[PDB]
A paper describes a structure:
To characterize polymeric NINJ1 at the atomic level, we expressed full-length, wild-type hNINJ1 (residues 1–152) recombinantly in Escherichia coli and extracted it from the bacterial membrane with the detergent n-dodecyl-β-d-maltopyranoside (DDM). The filaments were linear stacks of subunits, with an interval of 20.95 Å and a slight rotation of –1.05° per subunit. The cryo-EM map had a resolution of 3.8 Å, enabling us to build a molecular model of filamentous hNINJ1. The next 103 residues (residues 39–141) were well represented in the maps and could be modelled unambiguously as four α-helices α1–α4. Notably, the experimental density comprised two identical hNINJ1 filaments, which were packed together in an antiparallel arrangement. The hNINJ1 filament is organized by stacking of adjacent protomers in a fence-like manner. The two antiparallel helices α3 and α4 (residues 79–103 and 114–138, respectively) form the core of the filament. The two N-terminal helices α1 and α2 (residues 44–55 and 58–74, respectively) are separated by a distinct kink at L56. α2 thus adopts a parallel orientation with respect to α3 and α4, whereas α1 protrudes at a nearly 90° angle from the helical bundle and connects to the adjacent protomer via an extensive polymerization interface. The intermolecular contacts include multiple side chain interactions between helix α1 of one protomer and helices α1, α3 and α4 of the neighbouring protomer, of which a salt bridge between the highly conserved residues K45 and D53 is the most prominent. When analysing the surface hydrophobicity of the NINJ1 filament, we observed that one face of the filament is hydrophilic whereas the other face is hydrophobic. These properties directly explain how two hNINJ1 filaments have stacked via their hydrophobic faces to result in the soluble double filament resolved by cryo-EM.
Plasma membrane rupture was long thought to be driven by osmotic pressure, but it has recently been shown to be in many cases an active process, mediated by the protein ninjurin-18 (NINJ1). NINJ1 is a 16-kDa plasma membrane protein that is evolutionarily conserved and found in all higher eukaryotes. Our data thus suggest that, during lytic cell death, the extracellular α-helices of NINJ1 insert into the plasma membrane to polymerize NINJ1 monomers into amphipathic filaments that rupture the plasma membrane. The membrane protein NINJ1 is therefore an interactive component of the eukaryotic cell membrane that functions as an in-built breaking point in response to activation of cell death.
Numbering used by the authors:
A (entry chain F), B (entry chain C), C (entry chain E), D (entry chain B), E (entry chain D), F (entry chain A): 39 to 141
The structure:
Amino acid sequence: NHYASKKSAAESMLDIALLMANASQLKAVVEQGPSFAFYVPLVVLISISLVLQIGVGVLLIFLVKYDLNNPAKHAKLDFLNNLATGLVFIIVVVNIFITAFGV
Amino acid sequence: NHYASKKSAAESMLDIALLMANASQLKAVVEQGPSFAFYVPLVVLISISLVLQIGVGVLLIFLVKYDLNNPAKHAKLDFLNNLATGLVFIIVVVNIFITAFGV
Amino acid sequence: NHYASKKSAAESMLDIALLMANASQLKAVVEQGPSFAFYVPLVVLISISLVLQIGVGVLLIFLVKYDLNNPAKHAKLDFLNNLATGLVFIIVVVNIFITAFGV
Amino acid sequence: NHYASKKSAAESMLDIALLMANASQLKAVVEQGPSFAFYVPLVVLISISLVLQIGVGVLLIFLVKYDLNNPAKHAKLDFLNNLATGLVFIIVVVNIFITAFGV
Amino acid sequence: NHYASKKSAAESMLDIALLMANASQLKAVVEQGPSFAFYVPLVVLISISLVLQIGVGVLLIFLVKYDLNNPAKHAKLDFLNNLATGLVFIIVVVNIFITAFGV
Amino acid sequence: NHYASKKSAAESMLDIALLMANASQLKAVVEQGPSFAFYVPLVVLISISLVLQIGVGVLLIFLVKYDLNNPAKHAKLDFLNNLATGLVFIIVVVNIFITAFGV
């Protein structure tokens, strides 16, 4: 008898992000790096990775909830799917760079 | 009697980017910074600024050339315009940070 | 009961890239090289290899998802397939160069 | 009374490339750099810049000569124009980096 | 349930090139040569050999995929086959020269 | 009253090549280089440049003389023109490298 949506919202975005493992490691690497010494090339990758994770999450959720809000949008969905897919691919590349602990 | 498009393409994107002044300063700041000493907080801003400049340029050009490619896209144009405008606003904020030569 | 697409997008591009083995080695070679000494001719090959991997991935995904978006595109598909195939062939050549640990 | 096409071909591509000024400077910078000392970050930019100049030139010429070879290609032309424009924009960014004589 | 084409493209060109053994040896010879001493006459042969391998691979793949793209091309196929065959023959001659470890 | 074709053939190819200025300089550079000292990176460019000049000359002359030998070849002409144009563009790039007297 608890018809709230706070729990609904948190689970909805959490399942739409699913970056907990990705971000969690990103926190350790960006924490260990500066702690050990001054290494510039890795923090940049972390900064970009999280930024793109936000952008893709922003785009994915909106069209995931609905696709008939506008009078007609049938082919443009692929373009947004195309754009989001490219962002994920970039995220994959950078995530591979950082886990190597080097450029 | 030179019906090429190389000149057309370069001018088209150059007028669609118009970041020459923005980027040019970004090059000097990212060059002077590391030259003087190890300062981490500024290079990150430069990295993000150029990244967003690319993203907005990518989005702007496609819909600028045409808007009737899909069967119907009349209200979604605002959403893309909304997204691009937000990116520019972020670019403005970071550009203001870096020109201050501090966090 | 999790109708998300984040997992869908990541798997889609990951299976469309399948460069994890290729890139992973690229990270080690580009890390060991500068670590040992200054060797210019190998890093360039790594830089080009990943660049082309991105370009081919960009082209492959778009037409893989659909091929009837435009009013009619039946013969142009081969041209894009021709272009992507050439990029892969170039990627093969450079990948062979770098694994030789020499020019 | 010289109905050859060698002169036609050379002028056609030369006007389609128009990188003589761009490349010519690229030669001096990539020559002075290694001559002075070992500086890695600049040669990579030169290598990428020329590579993209080739790719865009490859794409531009084919569709510039004709656009009705296939049964119908009216909307895909924009996609190729979109792809080529992005490559030029990348070329602009790197060209700006290298002329700064720094990262 | 993985309807991708990255794997398709890589295998397609790899079976269309089948130079892995040829190139692999080319890497060792071009690596050992300069390592031992300054010997000019062999590297040139390696450079030409790989160049022709690219050219023939470029020509072979396009017409291998299809031969009815144009309104009619029945006799010209032999000319392209003639041209590609000559390139392979040249590749054979140079490959024989280099394996002799001499001019 | 001299209905020979030796003079016709020599002029025909000479006007179809028009590399006398290009080759003539190529001879001096490839002569001065080894004379001064052992410099590997320039002779390779000369070797490739002349090779491509031959290939383009081979292709250009055949289709220049006639284009109706086969039952029908109307669209394939562009492909050959496309291939030859690319070779010239490569020749331009290398010719620019060598005239710089450096890599």
